[PDB]
Amino acid sequence: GGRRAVPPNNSNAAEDDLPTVFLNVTSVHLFKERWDTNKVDHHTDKYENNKLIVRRGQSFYVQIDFSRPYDPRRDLFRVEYVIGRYPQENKGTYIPVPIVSELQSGKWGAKIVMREDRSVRLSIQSSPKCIVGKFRMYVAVWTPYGVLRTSRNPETDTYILFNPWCEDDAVYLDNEKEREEYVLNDIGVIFYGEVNDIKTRSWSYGQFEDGILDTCLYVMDRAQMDLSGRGNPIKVSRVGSAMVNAKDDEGVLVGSWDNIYAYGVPPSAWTGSVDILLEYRSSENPVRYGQCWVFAGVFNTFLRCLGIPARIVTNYFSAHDNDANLQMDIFLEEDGNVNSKLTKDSVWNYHCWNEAWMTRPDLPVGFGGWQAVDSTPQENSDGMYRCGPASVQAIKHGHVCFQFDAPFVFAEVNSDLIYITAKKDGTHVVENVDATHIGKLIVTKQIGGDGMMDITDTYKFQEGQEEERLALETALMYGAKKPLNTEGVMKSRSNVDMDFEVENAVLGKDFKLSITFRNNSHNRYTITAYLSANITFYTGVPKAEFKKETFDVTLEPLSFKKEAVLIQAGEYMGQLLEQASLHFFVTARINETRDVLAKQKSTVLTIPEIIIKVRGTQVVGSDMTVTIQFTNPLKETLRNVWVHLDGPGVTRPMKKMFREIRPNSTVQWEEVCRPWVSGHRKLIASMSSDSLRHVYGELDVQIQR
Template sequence: MGENLQVELVYFYPKENSKPHKTDKFELIYDEENPVPILRRGLKFTVAIRFKNDRFVNLEKDQIRLFFNFGPTPNPIKGTRAVIKLNTTRKRIEGENFWGANILDSSSDLILEVYSPTSTPVGVWKLEVETSLVNSTLPPSVYKHENDFYILFNPWNCHDLVYMPDERLLDEYILTDVGKIWVGPYGSSRGREWVYGQFDACVLPAAMLMFEKSDLVPASRGDPIKVCRTISKLVNSNDEDGVLVGRWDGQYEDGTAPSAWTGSVQILQEYLDTQFSVSYGQCWVFSGVVSTICRALGIPSRVISNLVSAHDANASLTVDKYYNVNNEEMDFDPNNPMGEDSIWNFHVWNDVWMARPDLPQGYGGWQAVDSTPQETSDGYYQCGPSSLEAIKKGQVGFSYDVAFMVASVNADVMRWKEDSTRELGFARIYTNKYHIGRTLLTKQPFIFDPNGDQDREDVTLQYKAPEGSKAERLSLYNAVRGTELAKSFFALPDPGLEDVEFDLEELERIKIGEGFCVVVHIKNRSDQPRTIKALLSAASVFYNGVKAHLVKKEDIEAVVKPKSTETMRMTVKADEYLDKLVEYCNLKLYAIASVTETRQTWTDEDDFEVLRPKIDIRIPPEITVARPTTITLRFVNPLKKILTNCKFSLSGPTLIRNQVIRYGDVKPGGLVKMNTDITPRSVGDQVLIVTFSSKELVDIRGSAKVAVVEPEE
């Protein structure tokens, strides 16, 4: 025995290891030329080493060391380099939190079971094998395995920080690759189907590219707190070359309209191919990509839609609007020259599941992370992870960004009118404690409803106590005590006793082409007549609350008799709003009124949606695997204008991979109809998601559930 063992090859058993590691859905494992092993930390995996030498391994004379390396400068102290010296005396026991290996067989090839700790950094690892002889002067021989492998978080392991005790839920929050995101105003929101596609071949490489562009050091990539905070920063492109460019103004000609996306895979594939940020995204698109990346990495994730969401720009825990002495809304915030508060008719972020060893006991579990650029945190556009328990209790001193999330779901809406007699120069004329965070929704586990919303789950009570309850007020006031500017806003007295009641009638939805009315009901509770001067208006708005076009405005005056009621009404015809609609077809009603005799002032607003048609997908309920099936897509153009730059986007895991089909112009009221073929790649229940977009009309969508079966014998 005069020479070192020479390694011929190393084999990771990618398919065999994937079953116990629950990674067998990843496409990378089945690459015919270069199958990529994908493993979970804290769980043993099998490796085989074959030697060129014409002799057996003798560990009394052969020294074999395995070096597992992570990142550009691996270091054992930082946990990015593991050194395992093989021996036959010390047996590695499962549950020990260090790297180790046991020899299963050495009769021909050397068969090992290798253990990684539950703190292992997550991402791409490399292996080197060093061989030498005991008491030999020969230098060691080093074999560098040319293929990388992935190690992921392990939510099935109770020692991992992302461990979820109810393991049944991991089928939804890790393994389910099609979901729903609730979009639209309160009262008319609907679940929008989204293909997460976390097992697609592009997803893990795209996630690694994202981390390479970040400032997160390799040693920290095993910490789910830091990983999720980085994801919230890098899915948007505001600070670094992240995945998606955000845009909300309807101008998407040089990219893809957010409403045209059907899922995350096409976005991440483009990001990986070009190495540049993809245009364009909005909050619900950002959240879909975040869930894809988190689920791929092994972090349980769900999408959260907050219907009526506050953007508190000045950390006052209020959403403030200001009016001049003539009841006209001011276009700036006198208390925040850097920006102004807004109310999004819906906003979407993510919850991720993890322990929080940096917080007191009881604040682990679901944590909110928001990748939509709104306000900076530690100098970057990032948000979270914020413990839902901390948000619910108003613990704004806990990391990270709890105050911003408290405001998002539970800020008070305040209205201010110019008044030179007041110290602030404004008098508070209105407070609404119930408007923000009307409902928080996510997809219910294990259910998918392609035709309705039977699969939605209301998680409002996980974010705050019941609205109007003593516990809800106490938690908000607890947050106020920890927020300097909020103290001054909440310390001001409420307006005095007011003897006229106002109520803006809410609209939930109308069909496109229908008219509507802005209606205010007035009740005079006093013994004297009251003169009411009101301004009613309607405007089209983007879903983030930014006004697009004024549709109509009317000044109305009325005298309400003592102890009686009156109704003010403004009628809006379809022709008055159709050419002023912007994407998602959201309209906002505004009303402001003042009482001449008492100087009482009231204001309110309401959002609603103009409903567009759905795509009718005609597909057999059962189709055969590996055989083409023709499907038909159809709907009627609801507008009195030609649709141009039309295209369909189709997606569905194993059914069709991100296909975009151009379509010709569509006449006013014309039928849009297209046939295409799909060829399913695997059996089981599948979902097909389709969107249609044009220059004049966007966010037309539909979905269908289909069973894919084996061919008959």
């Protein structure tokens, strides 16, 4: 075949039969027991797997039992490791491990640690740059005619993973607490809501469950990834993240934001990654519906499982689909009212993307560390694809010329808000620029518990700072664009500061919204504020404007006036969407100086929780009863209500349905579980009805062995 002598070796699952043709091997010993030296030492004891699983660049023991005692005078043998169907030591897919005298760091090698009557005991070491996969094992003997080799033995298959504990691996993490959280933790917390009202929920990463590590390799084989490249964090995150969004029957998850979900599970229903990854595997087709946090849970499960240090990040007021622009347009009418005809781009209340830890030998020194990777597509230089890995360190500084779509993530976090008046004659004029709305807060789960951490300054400097000025001018050099110069600037306000605030309602109630105007000038003004409240999706996309209102105001010199609006539940309850988000605008005009003041804020309606209840003996192998309790808060009969139950260690994900629930009644879910893991665990629940959804529940169960 003209193209190449050997077809690509891109499937781990594919294999060939290595030919078996004085000193024979009777038995080989791997200390694969989960309580054993190997797995414990390697931090691979957590996986629900019955094969040896080691971490590259570190020693482990094996013991060959030959037919007669090996003696270093007439005997020569070596352990062989092979992956894929076309192995070449030239390509790294065929590793001959030689019995070395000592173990040279960074290089494969065997060492006879001990020998006694037909059994040499070895301490094999692997290179820190080894291909990550499931390797086949063989013992080969080089006789004076040919080579005698072992037969195919499934039970000796070895999984070699990324090793963050090894100082020579790219994936190296210098802190146990971090390696604990960032790799070992299989339960995580995703944050949502909005800046002023952060909401929490739990996600089960389930990286150690039965089947997961094998589907992660399956995903890669589906990606048809070159075996030689699976030991490279970069290419691994770069290829994996591209498989998350089912690009038409290809990827893992079909992404959807239509509040219907005509044929799958509602994105909000999902309890964790396990649920999905195993359905993907079985169906072999894309699992239906996910959104920014779902794509991010499954992906984080993919990194952690393989050994790459990862954590999900949440950005508040996120400028997605930016196309590298650092400017978001809000269109205003001549009189000051918001213009909905064209003001078509939204800032997402919040947006979730992952962060993987690794080195960047492809860029200069210093850009190593955490790499932001977003598997939620957007238009970059190649089309509509996931973005990154981008060096978080480059972003913070403006070096957007460094690869893996860095400009499109810089924008997500650094866009300006421009309020432009569109005059009735086809003219345009800019009035105000808000340089402090986008990327107002970036947060992630704390290393200790389920608390939050402000990794905000890891992405940007504080506003006003010179370093900030600098990071901006730098991005501007490498392609980031600001198509509209502020030209002049913004409205001097005539020393008039205005700003509002929304009270934090509870689903179905009413809430105030005060508005404060502070005049600083020794001047009397005449304002005319307007209020526009809409029903939006969490992405900022408006469905309907439930309330509009206008105020006529007289501002006294050095005066401070405040006025209250009352938003009646009757105004919103009918149009509400999936996560109960409401967006407000408050554009105002100061008649004297025709100055435009403008403000935005979001609110999310507090929805009640599910109550999880456990009654019993919290001992591994012991039945323990859990109860899923939900009272339909809606003063309406909820239809086709589903409840999901998950909890890595304690339960396989389960889902119960109910044809309907009478307005204000309570349903109970009874289930007995046999926990296989001990230590602090966690039960997790979700609710999904034809109506209400994004109702979550979680219990901090404690288990002993």
